[PDB]
Design a protein around this nucleic acid. Structure first.
Length: 10
DNA sequence: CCGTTTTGTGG
């Protein structure tokens, strides 16, 4: 996720 | 050590 907590996706 | 959709990053 994110960053933080990538994306999603990417 | 964290975190869902795609196979990854600054926090």
């Amino acid at each position: 996720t994110x960053p933080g907590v990538t994306x999603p996706g990417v």
